[PDB]
């Protein structure tokens, strides 16, 4: 967290005025090309692509969506829980407009999506292909409280002929970092069900390990909440091995606390072009989240 | 009824030039309130719109 000044322009040409706002470390980078820092930083979305706002009045929270069919074509939905991503199904339903969907941006997990009752399901395009993704459908959900307790401020300052920037002003009081919290016991039960379903060909061999590293859009669990792009970390999960005795690890019921990060910019669908900006949310930032899914990748660099 | 000079851009970005035209008082308003000594003005719609 840094408080940062720079110049801006009025609607006129020559009129320029200084102004200050707040920025994180994710948005900018230090110019180490010089002798030292010397308070010298630069936006990365700037020096890779162009820049624009994201219509701050248009907040980026989801809506129940339903996809409808044209004339002469229809939708067919299988009504079997354990029916995996392919194959033959009998319990059919013909439809004109899809069930209510919440198509939310989420990495490594699902959010507020449809559930898979009855049993837990695990699929992949080619499970024998280690590089393929392992899509998951849980039986139940979990209350996920990812939240920043610090209120946001806004400075709606005109720049152009009606063009205004919503700068993240100074925050009130002692400014702690964000965080996120999750239940332990229901989480361990869902883990028990998952590891009970993991035995595709084995009796006891299962391990989880965190990602080796890479793009932060893929290296953690990101999503959108009240407009802000939250990245709530995934580290309380990989430290889990229900290999030999499942009930052995049903005991450590612990309120799972973790640091959840945030973000303002995005290049959706990994298209490296003109990025966008996210405004403040003014007021403390809660985020409820259910859970209905998960995604993994197998370890090809191992036995 | 007044007439005003002001800068504008030349087709060369490094070059600008002062040009002058005529305007009324309805489309502008006084600013920098040294209340009456050759006060400068600003358009009514530019400070809020394009």
């Amino acid at each position: 967290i840094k408080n940062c000044s720079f110049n801006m322009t009025t609607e006129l040409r020559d009129k320029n005025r200084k102004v200050y706002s707040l920025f994180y470390k994710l948005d900018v980078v230090q110019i180490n090309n010089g002798n030292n820092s010397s308070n010298l930083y630069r936006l990365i979305n700037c020096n890779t692509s162009a820049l624009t706002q994201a219509c701050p009045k248009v907040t980026f929270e989801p809506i129940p969506i339903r996809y409808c069919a044209p004339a002469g074509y229809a939708i067919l939905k299988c009504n079997d829980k354990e029916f995996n991503g392919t194959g033959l199904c009998k319990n059919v339903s013909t439809v004109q407009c899809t069930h209510g969907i919440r198509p939310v941006v989420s990495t490594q997990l699902l959010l507020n999506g449809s559930l898979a009752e009855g049993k837990v399901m695990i699929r992949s395009e080619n499970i024998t292909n280690n590089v393929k993704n392992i899509i998951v459908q849980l039986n139940e959900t979990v209350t996920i409280n990812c939240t920043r307790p610090n209120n946001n401020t806004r400075k709606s300052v005109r720049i152009g002929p009606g063009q205004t920037f919503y700068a993240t002003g100074d925050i009130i009081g002692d400014i702690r970092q964000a965080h996120c919290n999750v239940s332990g016991s229901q989480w361990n039960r869902a883990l028990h069900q998952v590891v009970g379903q993991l035995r595709e060909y084995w009796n006891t061999t299962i391990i989880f390990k965190n990602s080796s590293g890479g793009d932060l859009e893929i290296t953690t669990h990101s999503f959108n909440c009240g407009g802000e792009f939250f990245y709530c970390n995934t580290s309380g999960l990989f430290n889990s091995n229900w290999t030999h005795n499942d009930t052995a690890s049903m005991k450590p019921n612990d309120t799972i606390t973790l640091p959840c990060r945030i973000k303002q910019i995005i290049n959706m669908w990994q298209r490296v072009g003109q990025a966008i900006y996210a405004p403040p949310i003014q007021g403390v930032i809660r985020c409820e989240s259910n859970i209905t899914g998960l995604i993994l990748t197998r370890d090809g660099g191992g036995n | 009824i007044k007439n005003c000079s002001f800068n504008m851009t030349t087709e060369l970005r490094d070059k600008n030039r002062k040009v002058y035209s005529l305007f009324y008082k309805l489309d502008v308003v006084q600013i920098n309130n040294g209340n009456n000594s050759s006060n400068l003005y600003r358009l009514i719609n530019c400070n809020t719109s394009a």
Partner: antibody
Amino acid sequence: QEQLVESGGGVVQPGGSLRLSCLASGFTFHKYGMHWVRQAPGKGLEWVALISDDGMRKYHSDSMWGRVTISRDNSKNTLYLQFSSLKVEDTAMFFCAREAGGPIWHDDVKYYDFNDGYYNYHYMDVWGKGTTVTVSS
Amino acid sequence: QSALTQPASVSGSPGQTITISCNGTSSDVGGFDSVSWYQQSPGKAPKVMVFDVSHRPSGISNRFSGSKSGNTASLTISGLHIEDEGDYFCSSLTDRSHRIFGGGTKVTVLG
């Protein structure tokens, strides 16, 4: 015109205090800094003190530093100087001067301070009317 | 503390160009390039003569050209006028954000 006026000066006594006030008109005093300077008879100038606009900073000459205290009044659009332990060395005429406008020109582009503020560390485009002050025991 | 030293009095005939020269130190003149020159006549308030030394101040004639070398400053003038008689004081901004003036230079018209 940014026409300024002095007040409070005159024949006075040593040891007490002296409220030297400086008003003005013809402009907006909300965001303008001000210098106090003095010059004695048969002697040139000597910088007394300086103050910014928004009460943030203020600077004193090490000679007069501590013996005097500068202050401002934004609503009144006024500058004030409170003396302490008045001395005959303060016998001089005192001038209340302005700053070199607000913006800075680069590539014929005028940059400004924060909150559209007038700022410089530069010459004084205007000078007050002046006030005599005669400290004598 | 040491004011920017210059002779307390100078003289010259009208029209004949002259050059005022004042001294400084490393603290103010060697510390920055914001060397100014003011003028004040008997019965007149002070007014500037130079700021931003190699460019001239508001509304003054095109004859008064400032220059600076190391810790010293100077101002060359052509077409010596009569109304310009009076004291001249160069000033420089110290490194501590404080300023300091000079001793003075009274211009007297010969003839």
